[PDB]
């Protein structure tokens, strides 16, 4: 895409505010701008309501479904910055999302090496599926093509997320919870949900660890990984932009000051290092467990 057309979409220019030379790059068609507005938004996993796309595309929920579809098709990372919409709205968790990517590359016999790096890291972290586990599952898949009961990826993939590392300072958020959903809950699990529903989002340390991991396994909660402008983050070392913002940083510095130096927009950098922390690629410094508030299961 024209870097300039994109510049204008990013900064949310309506059509009329557009330079006629950028209007020239769109064949002077407004509808072509709108087409590239949806495109760029979907590709950059833009939040619907804060963005030009809300004016072109009329159904929000359909914008998010198309967003998730594109993200899955291009093997992108889960849009953790849209977890509220994806989980609460489309009822699709990180785990669900990656399950779909796994199913796609297995059922179509693609290589685990076709998965981008962070995507594969997140598949390992959520499905327990690294390259080796994937080689094993793939073989099971091809092996069972000889037996009367064939298997496809759905038959092999996990049906719940493996245990994930969860920092105490991660924030727990209530998913979309139905009555039948709770009908499967424990009472400590219900205690947590009602806490979150009443008091709002909850620091994860504040809750029972086993209720957090079990709600998380049911998909009844999702995790926010807070990154603020004052946040300082450290990196142990061992599209391509994420792998490039990643190598490019440490600098013993603020995140906002990390955005400026990096000359990449800040909101996009807060999201990216929230993602790096979540996945174990970056380490949010200054975190401090107050053991008087830490629930005892931790």
């Amino acid at each position: 895409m024209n870097i300039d057309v994109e510049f204008h979409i990013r900064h949310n220019y309506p059509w009329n505010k557009l330079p006629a030379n950028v209007r020239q790059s769109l064949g002077n068609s407004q509808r072509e701008y709108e087409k590239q507005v949806v495109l760029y938004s979907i590709r950059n996993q833009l939040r619907y309501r804060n963005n030009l796309v809300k004016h072109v595309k009329k159904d929000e929920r359909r914008y998010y479904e198309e967003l998730l579809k594109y993200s899955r098709d291009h093997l992108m990372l889960y849009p953790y910055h849209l977890s509220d919409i994806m989980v609460k709205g489309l009822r699709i968790t990180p785990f669900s999302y990656y399950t779909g990517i796994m199913e796609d590359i297995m059922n179509s016999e693609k290589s685990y090496d076709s998965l981008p790096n962070f995507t594969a890291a997140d598949c390992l972290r959520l499905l327990g599926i690294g390259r080796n586990q994937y080689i094993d599952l793939m073989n099971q898949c091809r092996s069972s093509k000889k037996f009367f009961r064939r298997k496809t990826a759905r038959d092999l993939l996990p049906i719940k997320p493996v245990e994930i590392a969860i920092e105490a300072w991660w924030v727990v958020q209530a998913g979309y919870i139905t009555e039948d959903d709770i009908k499967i809950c424990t009472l400590p699990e219900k205690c947590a949900v009602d806490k979150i529903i009443d008091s709002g989002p909850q620091l994860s340390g504040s809750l029972d660890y086993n209720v957090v991991h079990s709600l998380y396994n049911k998909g009844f909660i999702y995790l926010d990984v807070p990154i603020s402008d004052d946040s300082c983050i450290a990196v142990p070392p061992l599209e391509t932009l994420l792998y490039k913002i990643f190598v490019s940083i440490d600098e013993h510095t603020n995140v906002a000051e990390l955005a400026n130096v990096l000359e990449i927009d800040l909101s996009l950098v807060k999201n990216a290092v929230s993602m790096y922390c979540r996945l174990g690629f970056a380490h949010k410094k200054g975190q401090v467990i107050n053991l008087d508030q830490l629930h005892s299961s931790w």
Partner: peptide
């Protein structure tokens, strides 16, 4: 079991309003 996008959307627990209508 895990939540599924195929699941039927029932009533919202405690009348918490959806992201979507």
């Amino acid at each position: 079991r895990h939540v599924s996008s195929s699941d039927r959307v029932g009533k919202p627990y405690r009348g918490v309003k959806p992201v979507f209508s």
